[PDB]
Design a protein around this ligand. Sequence first.
Ligand SMILES: CCCCCCCCCCCCCCCCCC(=O)OC[C@H](COP(=O)(O)OCCN)OC(=O)CCCCCCCCCCCCCCCCC
Ligand SMILES: CCCCCCCCCCCCCCCCCC(=O)OC[C@H](COP(=O)(O)OCCN)OC(=O)CCCCCCCCCCCCCCCCC
Ligand SMILES: CCCCCCCCCCCCCCCCCC(=O)OC[C@H](COP(=O)(O)OCCN)OC(=O)CCCCCCCCCCCCCCCCC
Ligand SMILES: CCCCCCCCCCCCO[C@@H]1O[C@H](CO)[C@@H](O[C@H]2O[C@H](CO)[C@@H](O)[C@H](O)[C@H]2O)[C@H](O)[C@H]1O
Ligand SMILES: CCCCCCCCCCCCO[C@@H]1O[C@H](CO)[C@@H](O[C@H]2O[C@H](CO)[C@@H](O)[C@H](O)[C@H]2O)[C@H](O)[C@H]1O
Ligand SMILES: CCCCCCCCCCCCO[C@@H]1O[C@H](CO)[C@@H](O[C@H]2O[C@H](CO)[C@@H](O)[C@H](O)[C@H]2O)[C@H](O)[C@H]1O
Ligand SMILES: Nc1nc2c(ncn2[C@@H]2O[C@H](COP(=O)(O)OP(=O)(O)OP(=O)(O)O)[C@@H](O)[C@H]2O)c(=O)[nH]1
Ligand SMILES: N=C(N)NC(=N)NCCc1ccc(I)c(Cl)c1
Ligand SMILES: [Mg+2]
Lengths: 98, 83, 48, 140, 320, 347, 113, 63, 52
Amino acid sequence: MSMVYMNIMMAFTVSLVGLLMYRSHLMSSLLCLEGMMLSLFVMAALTILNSHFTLASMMPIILLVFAACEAALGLSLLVMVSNTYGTDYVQNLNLLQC
Amino acid sequence: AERVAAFLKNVWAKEPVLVASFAIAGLAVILPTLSPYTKYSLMINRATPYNYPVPLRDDGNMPDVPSHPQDPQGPSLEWLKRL
Amino acid sequence: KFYIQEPPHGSPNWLKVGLTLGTSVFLWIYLIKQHNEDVLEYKRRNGL
Amino acid sequence: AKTVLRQYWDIPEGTECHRKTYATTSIGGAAGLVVSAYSVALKTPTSFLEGVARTGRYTFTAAAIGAIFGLTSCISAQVREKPDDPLNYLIGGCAGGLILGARTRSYGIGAAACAYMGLTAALVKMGQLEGWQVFAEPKV
Amino acid sequence: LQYGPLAYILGEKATKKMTEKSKLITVDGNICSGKSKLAKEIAEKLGLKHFPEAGIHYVDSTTGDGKPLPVQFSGNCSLEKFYDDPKSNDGNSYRLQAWLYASRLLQYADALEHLLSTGQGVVLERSIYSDFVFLEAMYRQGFIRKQCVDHYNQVKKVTICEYLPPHVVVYVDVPVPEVQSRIQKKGNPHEMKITSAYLQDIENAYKGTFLPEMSEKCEVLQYSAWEAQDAEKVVEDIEYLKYDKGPWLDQNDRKLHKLRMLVQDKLEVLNYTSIPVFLPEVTVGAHQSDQVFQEFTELPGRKYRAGYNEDVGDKWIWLK
Amino acid sequence: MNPIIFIIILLTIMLGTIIVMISSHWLLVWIGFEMNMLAIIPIMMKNHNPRATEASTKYFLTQSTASMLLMMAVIINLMFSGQWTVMKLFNPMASMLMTMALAMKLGMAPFHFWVPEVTQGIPLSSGLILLTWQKLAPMSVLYQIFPSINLNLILTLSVLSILIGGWGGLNQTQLRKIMAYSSIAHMGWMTAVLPYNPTMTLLNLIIYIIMTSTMFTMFMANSTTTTLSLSHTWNKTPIMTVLILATLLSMGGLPPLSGFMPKWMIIQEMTKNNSIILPTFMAITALLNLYFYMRLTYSTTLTMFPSTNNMKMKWQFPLMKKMTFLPTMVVLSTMMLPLTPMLSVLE
Amino acid sequence: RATFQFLPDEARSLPPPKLTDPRLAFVGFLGYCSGLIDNAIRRRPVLLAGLHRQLLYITSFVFVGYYLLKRQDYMYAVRDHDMFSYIKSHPEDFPEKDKKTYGEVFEEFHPVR
Amino acid sequence: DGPEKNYERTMAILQIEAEKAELRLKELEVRRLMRARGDGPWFHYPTIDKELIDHSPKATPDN
Amino acid sequence: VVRDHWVHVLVPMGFVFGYYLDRKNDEKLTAFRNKSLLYKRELKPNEEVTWK
Ligand SMILES: CCCCCCCCCCCCCCCCCC(=O)OC[C@H](COP(=O)(O)OCCN)OC(=O)CCCCCCCCCCCCCCCCC
Ligand SMILES: CCCCCCCCCCCCCCCCCC(=O)OC[C@H](COP(=O)(O)OCCN)OC(=O)CCCCCCCCCCCCCCCCC
Ligand SMILES: CCCCCCCCCCCCCCCCCC(=O)OC[C@H](COP(=O)(O)OCCN)OC(=O)CCCCCCCCCCCCCCCCC
Ligand SMILES: CCCCCCCCCCCCO[C@@H]1O[C@H](CO)[C@@H](O[C@H]2O[C@H](CO)[C@@H](O)[C@H](O)[C@H]2O)[C@H](O)[C@H]1O
Ligand SMILES: CCCCCCCCCCCCO[C@@H]1O[C@H](CO)[C@@H](O[C@H]2O[C@H](CO)[C@@H](O)[C@H](O)[C@H]2O)[C@H](O)[C@H]1O
Ligand SMILES: CCCCCCCCCCCCO[C@@H]1O[C@H](CO)[C@@H](O[C@H]2O[C@H](CO)[C@@H](O)[C@H](O)[C@H]2O)[C@H](O)[C@H]1O
Ligand SMILES: Nc1nc2c(ncn2[C@@H]2O[C@H](COP(=O)(O)OP(=O)(O)OP(=O)(O)O)[C@@H](O)[C@H]2O)c(=O)[nH]1
Ligand SMILES: N=C(N)NC(=N)NCCc1ccc(I)c(Cl)c1
Ligand SMILES: [Mg+2]
C-alpha cells in the first residue's frame, strides 16, 4: 500500500497498545480511546476520498458522532469513579475480584 | 381555550424567550406546506446543470427530444425568467 | 378464615375472565378455519 | 508454530535424533514462554528480577520436557528399529512427565504426568498414522 | 390496578395525595412510660392512623384472619420467658429481639405504605429506629453475646437504609425510679422482675444515641411525665412544627415511587432478616423447620394464596 | 429511574440489537453495537453503588475496545474490497480483528475476565439481559461472516471457553458468578459448531437463552444471589426447588431433558465432518459444568439446609414478583427433547 | 425459499399437519403442564384454580405449535426436493451400481473358537 | 399375533428403515459435493446483488 | 364410578388405550400383507385381508 497507510496503521496500533497497557489514571486510557477513533477517522477518510466513493464521504462524520457518545459515556463513568474514591485511579476498581 | 389562553398570557409574562422560540419553530414546521412557492424550490434545484447533458443516439423515433439546443422541444425555463 | 384484609384475588376479575375465554375461542376458531383453508388449498394445487 | 511443527514431522523417526530434539525443545520452550507471559501479566512479580526468575524457571522446565521427549522417543525408535510404533511416544511422553515431576520435586506429579503425558503422546502418534483431525475442515 | 410502574405513569403519584397533614409520628420512652395512651390520643386528635406497638404477634394481625397464631409459628420466642430467665440456654433473649426487630420492620413498611398510598399520617409506638435500645440493654446486662449484637447490626444496616425516618419523634422522659414504681403498680408477675440496671440501660441508650441521632434528621419533642398527660398540649406542639430538616424535603415522586414499590412487597421488606448467618439463637435445624412448616400450611386459610382457600368460604376458585 | 425512562432505555437496548440484525451495511452494524452499549450502561448503574460503578466501568472499557477493533476490521475490509456489505470479509487480517472483537463482546475466553465480575456487580435483572439478550447481536454477526473466519482461531476460542468456563465455575459460591462461568462455557459450544453448521449455533443459542432466563427469573423470585440464601428456598417455596432442580439438570445436558438437545446435535454435525476428538473432548469437559450444577441441586433441592427463625415470618406472605413467562420457560427448558426435529424451523 | 418469510407460498402445496397430530398433542400437553406450574408457583389449587387461564395455556401452545410443525414439515420437504434435484443434475456423481449376490461376493470367515 | 402378521409387519418395518438409511447416505454425499463445488442450493453464500448497480451516464465518460 | 373408586379405571383404561394404539400402528405396516414370498397366497372367497 501507499506509504501514508503505514503511518496511520502504525498510529492505530500505538493507540491500541496504549489502551491495553494501563497506568493509573483512567483518563489517560480514555484519551487512548479517542486517539484510536482519530486514526480510524483519518484512515477511513483517506480511503473514501482517494476512491471518489462519494456517498461514503458522510461515513467519517457518523464515526465522530458515535466517538463523542463514547467519550461522553466514558467521562460520565469517570465522574462516578472519582466521587467514590477521590481519584480516577483504576486500581481502586478491584472490588469485584470477590 | 380559556385554559390555554390563560396559559399563553402566563408564559408571555414569565418566559417570553421560550414563547418566541416555540412560535418561530412552529412557523418553520408549518409554513413550508402552506407556501405556494415551495414547489419552485425543487424546480430550480432540478434546473441547475452540474453535469454534462449527454446526448441520445438518434434512433429515428424520439420526436420530443430536441436535435439542437435552440429547437422548441425539451424543457424550458421561461417560468424561471418570470420569477 | 374470613380475611382481616380483602384479598387482591378475593373475587374474579371478570374483565380478565372474559378476555381470556374470548381469546381462547378466537384462537381456536382462527386455527380451525386456517386448517380448513390449508386442506382445501392443498387438494386444489394437487388436483384432488 | 506451524513451521516448527512441520520440521519435527518432516524428519523421519530415528533419523537425525539431534535434529528431532531441536524441534521438540523449540516447541517446549515456546510453550513455556507463553505460560510465563500470561503468568507474569496476571500475577505481577514482586520485582523485575523475580519476573525474570519465574520466566526462566517455566521456560527451562518446558524446554526440558520437550527435550527429553523428542530425544527419548527418537532413541527408542532407533534402538527398537520400529519407527512407526506409538509405544515410542508413550516412553518419550512418560519420560517428559517424569522430568516435570523432577523439576517440581513431587513424585505424585511425576507419576500422574508420566501416565497422562505418555498416553497423550501415544495418542498423537496414532492420530498422525491414521490421519485423525483435531480441527477438522468443514466438508458437509 | 395494583400499584406499579403503570399506575405511576397514569397518575398515581405520591405528591398528589400528600398534604401538610401527611406525617409519620413515633412515640418513644421507657417501659411503662405512658407511650400507648399518648400515642392513641395524638392519633385521634390529629386524625391519623394509630399503630399499636408491634409485638410478637404483629404479623399475624395483618395476614390470615388477623388472630394470633400458636407460638411455634413465632419461633416459640416469649417475652414472659425473657423476664423469668433473661439468660436462657435456648437463646430466647436474642431470638425474641431478632423477631421483634423484624416485626417492627414490617410495621414500618405497612405504615409507610399507608402514608404514601392515602396521604393520611400514622402514629407508631417505637420503631426500627429505636429498637436497638433494648438490644443495647440486653447486651450490657449479659443477656446476649457480642455475636448476637453483631448479627443485629448486620441486619439493621441492610434494612434501615431503605426507608425514611419519622417526621416527628415524641419522647416521654420518665425517670427510672418512677418507672420501677409504675411497673410495680401494674401487677403482671413477670415484668416485676425487671432490674433497675436494665431500665437504666434503656434510658442511657435512648438519650445517649437515639435522640442525638434523630435530632439531626427529625423534629424531636421531649416531654416530661406531667406534660405528657395532656395529649392536647402535645398536639399543639406538633401543629406548629416548622419541618425544616431531614431527608423528607429531598423526596420527589420518582423517589417515593421507588419507596412504594418496596414497602408494598413484604417479602422484599423482610428479605435480609433471614440472612444465612448461623447463630445458635436463631438457627433452626432442618427437621424442626420442616415439621413446623407443614403444620403452618394445615392451619385454616393458610394452605393457598389468600382468596383461594375453600375451607374458609372462598368461591369462584376455578375462575380466580 | 422514572418508569418511562426505563422503558425507553430498554427499547433502545433492543433497537441497537435489532439494527445489527437487519443491517446489510457494516457501518450500521457498528452503529447498532454502539447504540446497544450506550443504553445498557444506565441499566448497570441503576442501583448506584461502588460495585455497580466498577461493573459498568469494566464493561464500558471492554465493549468500547472491542468496537474499535470491529471498526478497524470494517475499514481494512473497505480498503481491500471497496464495499461495506455485511458478509464474508475480504482480508484475513480483517477477519482476525472482527473475530477477536466479537469474541470480546461475547466474553469468550481468553477475553472472558469481565463476564464474572460484571455479572456479579449488577442486579439480577440486569445480569439476565447481559447473559442472554446481549449475545444475540455478536452471534448474528458471526452467523454471517463465518465463511471467512479462521478455523483454528474460532475452535481455539471455543475450546478455551469450555475449559475456562467449566473450571471457573467450580470455585464459585455466588450465583451470578456461577451463571457467568456457565455462560462462558456455553458460548464455546455455540462457536465450536459455527464453522460446520451455523443452524446448530442458533439452536444452542435459543435453548441456552431459555434455560438462562428460567434460572435468573427463579433467582429473582426469591431475591437470592448466593448459594446459601438459595438454600432457604425449600423452607418457603418448595415448588421452586423442584423447578430449579429440573432446570439445572437440563443445563447440564442430561437426557431426557431439553438441554441435552444442543449437545446431541452439535456432536452429530461435528462427527459428520470427521471431527471426533474435539466433540469427545468438549463433552467430557462439560462434565465440569454438570459438577457445579449438581452442587447447587444438593444445597437447594436434594437436601434440607439449616434455616433461621425469622424465616417463619415469610410463610405468611405470597410471592409478589412478576415471574413473567416463568411457567412457559421452565416447561420449554425441560420438556422439549421429544420435539427435536423442530430444529428445521431454524434453517 | 422466499426471503424472511415464515411459510413461503410454495408450502401450500403440502398437506397441513392434522389437528390430531401426535406432536401437536404433545405440544398441547406442554401447555397443560405450563398451566399447572403457573398455579403451583402462585400457591393456587393446582388442578382446579383458574380454568380459563389453563385453557389459554393449552390453546396458545397448540396455536403456535401448529405453525411451527407446518414450517418444520415444509423445511424437510425442501431438503428432500433439493437433494433429489441435485442427484438428477449430476448423474455421474451418483452412479447406479451393479449389485452382486452373496454367492458371488467373497467375505472372509472369522471363527469364534 | 400369528407368525404371518409379525413376519410381514417386519418386512414393512425393514423397508422403511432401509429406505431411510439409503437417503441418509445420499444426503451426506450430496452435502459433501454441494459444499465443495458451490453448485447447489445449499452452502449458497450471498454475493453482492447486481440490481444495486446504476448504469446511468455519469459525470465523466470512462466508467 | 363411585366417588371412592373412580381412580381404579385409569390404569385399565391406559392398557385398553395402549392396546388400541398398538393395533392402529399395525395398520401403517401393511405394505407387505399377503406379499411376502413365504406367506403370499390367495384370499378365501369371503376374506378381505389376510390379517388386520
Ligand atoms: C415429558 C417428556 C419429557 C421428559 C423430561 C422430564 C419431564 C419432567 C420435567 C420436570 C419439569 C419440572 C416440573 C416438575 C413438577 C414438580 C411437582 C412438584 O414438585 O410437586 C409439588 C411440590 C411442591 O410442594 P408444595 O407446593 O409446598 O405442596 C405441599 C407439599 N409440600 O413439590 C415438593 O413439595 C417437593 C419438595 C421436596 C423436594 C423433593 C425433590 C425430589 C423430587 C424431585 C422430583 C422431580 C424431578 C424432576 C426432574 C426430572 C425428572 C426426570
Ligand atoms: C396422563 C398424565 C400423565 C402424567 C405425565 C407427567 C409428565 C411430567 C409433567 C411435568 C409437569 C407436572 C405438572 C406441574 C406440577 C404441578 C403439580 C404440583 O406442583 O404439585 C402437586 C399438585 C397437588 O398439590 P397442591 O399444590 O396442593 O394442589 C392441589 C391440586 N389438587 O398437583 C396435583 O395434584 C397432581 C398434579 C400432577 C403431579 C405432577 C408431579 C410432577 C412429576 C414430575 C416427575 C417427572 C415426570 C415423569 C418423567 C417421565 C415423563 C413422561
Ligand atoms: C416450540 C413448541 C412448543 C410451543 C411453545 C409456544 C410458546 C409460545 C406460546 C405462548 C406461551 C404463553 C401462553 C400464556 C398463556 C397464559 C395467558 C393467560 O392465561 O392470561 C390470563 C390473564 C391475561 O389474559 P389476557 O391477556 O387478558 O387475554 C386477552 C389478550 N388480549 O391474566 C393472567 O392471570 C395470566 C398470568 C400468567 C401469565 C404469565 C405471564 C405472561 C403474561 C402473558 C399475558 C397474556 C398472554 C396471552 C397469550 C396469547 C398468545 C397467543
Ligand atoms: C405563540 C404560541 C406558541 C406558545 C408556546 C409556548 C410554550 C411554552 C413552553 C413552557 C415554557 C415556560 O417554562 C416553564 O413552563 C412551565 C410549565 O411547563 C410553566 O409553569 C406552568 O406549569 C403548569 C403547566 O405546565 C401550570 O399549572 C402552572 O400554573 C404554570 O406556571 C412556567 O411558567 C415556565 O417557567
Ligand atoms: C513436543 C514438545 C513437548 C512440549 C512439552 C511442554 C510441557 C508443558 C510445560 C508448561 C509450562 C510449565 O508449567 C509450569 O511448570 C512449573 C515447574 O517449574 C510449575 O511451577 C511450580 O513448580 C516449581 C516448584 O514448585 C516452580 O516452577 C514453582 O515454584 C511452582 O509454581 C508450574 O505450576 C507450571 O505451571
Ligand atoms: C489430556 C488429553 C487431551 C486431548 C488429547 C487429544 C489427542 C489428539 C492426538 C493428535 C491428533 C493427530 O495429530 C496430528 O495428526 C495429523 C494427521 O492427520 C498429523 O499431520 C501430519 O501428517 C504428515 C505426515 O503424516 C506430516 O508430514 C505433517 O507434518 C502433518 O500434516 C500431525 O503431525 C499430528 O500432530
Ligand atoms: N426485649 C424487648 N422487650 C420489649 C421491646 N418492646 C417492648 N418490649 C417489652 O414489651 C412490654 C411493653 O412495653 P411498654 O409499652 O413500653 O410498657 P407499657 O406497659 O405498655 O407502658 P406504655 O409505654 O404506656 O405503653 C415491656 O415489657 C417491654 O419490655 C423490645 O424491642 N425488646
Ligand atoms: N450444514 C450446513 N451448514 N448447511 C445445511 N443446513 N446443510 C444441510 C441442508 C439442509 C438441511 C435441512 C434443511 I430443512 C434444508 Cl432445506 C437443507
Ligand atoms: Mg405499651
